[PDB]
Amino acid sequence: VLSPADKTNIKASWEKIGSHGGEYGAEALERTFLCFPTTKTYFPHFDLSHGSAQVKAHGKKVADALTNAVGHLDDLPGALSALSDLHAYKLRVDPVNFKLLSHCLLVTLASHHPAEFTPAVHASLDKFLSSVSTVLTSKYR
Amino acid sequence: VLSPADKTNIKASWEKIGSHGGEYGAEALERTFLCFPTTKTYFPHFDLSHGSAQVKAHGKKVADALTNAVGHLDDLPGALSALSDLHAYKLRVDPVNFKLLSHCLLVTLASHHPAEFTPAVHASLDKFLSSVSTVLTSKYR
Amino acid sequence: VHLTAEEKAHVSGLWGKVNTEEVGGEALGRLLVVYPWTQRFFETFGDLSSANAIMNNPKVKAHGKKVLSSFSDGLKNLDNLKGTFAALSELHCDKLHVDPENFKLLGNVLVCVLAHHFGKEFTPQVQAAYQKIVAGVANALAHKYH
Amino acid sequence: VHLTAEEKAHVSGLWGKVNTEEVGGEALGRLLVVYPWTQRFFETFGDLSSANAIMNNPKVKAHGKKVLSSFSDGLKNLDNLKGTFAALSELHCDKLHVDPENFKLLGNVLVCVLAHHFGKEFTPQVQAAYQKIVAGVANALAHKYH
Ligand code: HEM
Ligand code: HEM
Numbered sequence: 001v002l003s004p005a006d007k008t009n010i011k012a013s014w015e016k017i018g019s020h021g022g023e024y025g026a027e028a029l030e031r032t033f034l035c036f037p038t039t040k041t042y043f044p045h046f047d048l049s050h051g052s053a054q055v056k057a058h059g060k061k062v063a064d065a066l067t068n069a070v071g072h073l074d075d076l077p078g079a080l081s082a083l084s085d086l087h088a089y090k091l092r093v094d095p096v097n098f099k100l101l102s103h104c105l106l107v108t109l110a111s112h113h114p115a116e117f118t119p120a121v122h123a124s125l126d127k128f129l130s131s132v133s134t135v136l137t138s139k140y141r
Numbered sequence: 142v143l144s145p146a147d148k149t150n151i152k153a154s155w156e157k158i159g160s161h162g163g164e165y166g167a168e169a170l171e172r173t174f175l176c177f178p179t180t181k182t183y184f185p186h187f188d189l190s191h192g193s194a195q196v197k198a199h200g201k202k203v204a205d206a207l208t209n210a211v212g213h214l215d216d217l218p219g220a221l222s223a224l225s226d227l228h229a230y231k232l233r234v235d236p237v238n239f240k241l242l243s244h245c246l247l248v249t250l251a252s253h254h255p256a257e258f259t260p261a262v263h264a265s266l267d268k269f270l271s272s273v274s275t276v277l278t279s280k281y282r
Numbered sequence: 283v284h285l286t287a288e289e290k291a292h293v294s295g296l297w298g299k300v301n302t303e304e305v306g307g308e309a310l311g312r313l314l315v316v317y318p319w320t321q322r323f324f325e326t327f328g329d330l331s332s333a334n335a336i337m338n339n340p341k342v343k344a345h346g347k348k349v350l351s352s353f354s355d356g357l358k359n360l361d362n363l364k365g366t367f368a369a370l371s372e373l374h375c376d377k378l379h380v381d382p383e384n385f386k387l388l389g390n391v392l393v394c395v396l397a398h399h400f401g402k403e404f405t406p407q408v409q410a411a412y413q414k415i416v417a418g419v420a421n422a423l424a425h426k427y428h
Numbered sequence: 429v430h431l432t433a434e435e436k437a438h439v440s441g442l443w444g445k446v447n448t449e450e451v452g453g454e455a456l457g458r459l460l461v462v463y464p465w466t467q468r469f470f471e472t473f474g475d476l477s478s479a480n481a482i483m484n485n486p487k488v489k490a491h492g493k494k495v496l497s498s499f500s501d502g503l504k505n506l507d508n509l510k511g512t513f514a515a516l517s518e519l520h521c522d523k524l525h526v527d528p529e530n531f532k533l534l535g536n537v538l539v540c541v542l543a544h545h546f547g548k549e550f551t552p553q554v555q556a557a558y559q560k561i562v563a564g565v566a567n568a569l570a571h572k573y574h
């Protein structure tokens with residue numbers, strides 16, 4: 001359960017990430033494929049090269065949905081229902097995979113934005129990414 | 142996230158428990174203390190000997206919290222806020238222990254209510270317990 | 283895991299009453315219903331779209347049986363679980379790509395399934411011994427991710 | 429973990445530049461701030477009420493330093509991680525009762541901290557090798573529990 005400070009923290013930090021999200025998403029994805037290879041069995045139909053243009057494109061799609069979610073912290077189930085149908089019903093992603101990508105996202109943010117990545121921001125962001133994960137892996141339609 | 146089919150199944154099976162929550166809750170505690178000894182660490186001040194009256198009484202309180210929870214399925218952060226205060230700020234219970242107690246509760250139920258313990262109800266109560274557990278280990282006010 | 287002589291007796295004494303045709307299919311059915319992302323692993327088994335479809339699929343029942351006599355071989359070799367699952371471990375690591383966190387879940391499911399069948403006689407002492415078994419089997423099955 | 433010589437170089441290359449005082453401290457604080465139940469184990473350390481209190485707490489820093497020196501000793505015995513962490517395993521299992529699940533959490537906090545200090549130099553590849561260490565430290569700390 002997100003606290004209010006959690007929200008004002010989550011929104012604050014996403015302000016800074018902001019127009020850079022697109023590439024943080026791709027870096028995060030790249031980080032995960034690379035550090036936890038099993039995750040690539042989910043994208044058999046993708047170029048998983050280091051420069052990959054699809055990975056970049058997909059990072060952008062991931063980061064948008066993350067933007068979307070920061071706007072809807074009081075009703076995440078409502079806002080991410082379509083992403084939930086996709087990940088839970090259709091693709092059937094093992095939830096451990098979310099833990100891996102969420103960790104790689106945090107690491108990405110830490111890398112590009114050390115001054116904004118205070119312990120407290122770290123803390124709210126981790127709750128955030130894990131709420132998001134619960135919604136995406138739940139079947140509630 | 143719970144679907145209203147989960148909600149329907151959670152209510153059903155909890156109604157079938159009836160006036161037995163208390164015994165189930167005590168037995169669930171017994172089993173958790175016994176299968177995972179390190180849980181006992183949280184109760185250094187209790188009589189944990191088998192059959193104990195402090196345990197039966199506490200089971201009754203745990204089962205009432207659950208009945209309370211079943212009654213407010215649309216607003217568990219709201220309804221459980223004092224219990225989150227107790228388990229998250231004051232007692233600081235490792236989340237792992239909630240998984241352990243939840244599993245022992247389901248075994249308790251399965252062993253007393255086989256006809257009810259259908260797969261679909263099993264699936265719902267687990268969501269239920271994990272939803273409860275998240276709220277009680279979250280610091281949100 | 284590492285069982286005392288007394289725990290071996292509870293575990294072996296219960297297992298003789300276990301219907302190996304029913305129990306494995308019920309264990310696996312429930313894993314697929316309760317932990318539904320586990321269906322991704324068993325697509326080629328048929329439609330798995332409802333609790334009732336999953337619980338009546340004959341491929342689910344038949345795979346279940348295999349899982350469960352594998353556990354039986356386990357019981358005959360408790361003091362070397364690693365050794366007796368080395369092969370199964372490779373299979374699930376390199377070929378199938380099953381995260382080991384799912385071995386724990388199937389383990390707890392099986393236990394719930396035991397409590398279902400045996401009711402009262404699934405006493406807390408007996409459960410305690412099985413929890414050691416399934417912990418140990420989940421662990422054996424995982425050590426090839428090292 | 430047996431690390432490949434490439435991985436061993438990525439790891440040891442970066443370790444050489446880690447302020448073992450700063451970093452041990454930051455990783456521990458962040459552990460208590462981000463996974464606040466971990467505070468229960470550290471009650472005799474003083475006020476752990478606010479993030480700031482935790483990050484500035486002297487006893488937290490000092491303990492940070494031990495944790496990391498322990499990690500440093502790990503890097504020296506890379507191919508006997510389990511025996512190098514035998515004693516710390518018992519201490520954490522039988523004396524303190526810290527669930528094995530928190531070790532992978534501290535590894536993860538540790539990795540975040542290293543990303544935070546080295547930005548661009550913490551490249552995906554280097555990270556892949558640290559994930560392997562931390563995972564290995566965690567497994568080695570868990571030996572006595574199973
Ligand atoms: C916070 C976590 C995640 C978010 C916000 C997210 C979001 C998204 C979004 C926005 C799409 C695009 C849907 C579309 O418009 O086509 C998508 C597709 C997809 N996601 Fe995720 N996702 C997340 C986690 C994961 C994880 C952990 C996996 C498994 C490793 C995964 C696997 C996929 C796959 C395989 C696709 C379809 C790829 C394609 O064919 O184009 N996602 N996801
Ligand atoms: C759904 C799961 C749980 C529920 C519903 C629950 C409910 C409760 C309730 C209602 C109380 C007492 C309220 C009062 O008298 O003011 C309580 C107290 C307590 N709980 Fe839980 N609890 C749960 C899980 C756990 C777990 C897993 C642990 C640790 C193993 C734990 C440890 C404690 C402790 C140490 C107390 C203090 C009891 C005393 O000193 O009198 N709880 N819980």
Ligand code: HEM
Pocket residue numbers: 320323324345348349350352353370374378380384385386388389419420423
């Ligand atoms: C924890 C106890 C487990 C045991 C004892 C076990 C045992 C087995 C056995 C005996 C086989 C078949 C090999 C053969 O017939 O020659 C198998 C294969 C397989 N396992 Fe498991 N397993 C376990 C857990 C899991 C889990 C948790 C999953 C995934 C959720 C899984 C996924 C699979 C899959 C997809 C196959 C291939 C079956 C086929 O397509 O024929 N296993 N395992």
Ligand code: HEM
Pocket residue numbers: 466469470491494495498499516520524526530531534535565566569
């Ligand atoms: C990477 C994982 C970890 C490593 C390598 C590690 C290492 C250490 C070391 C070297 C000591 C000091 C032992 C001595 O020389 O006397 C220690 C003590 C201790 N550790 Fe850990 N630790 C880890 C994780 C954890 C975690 C996650 C917790 C709690 C959640 C924890 C709780 C404690 C406690 C309570 C002490 C006693 C401290 C005192 O009162 O002085 N450890 N650990």
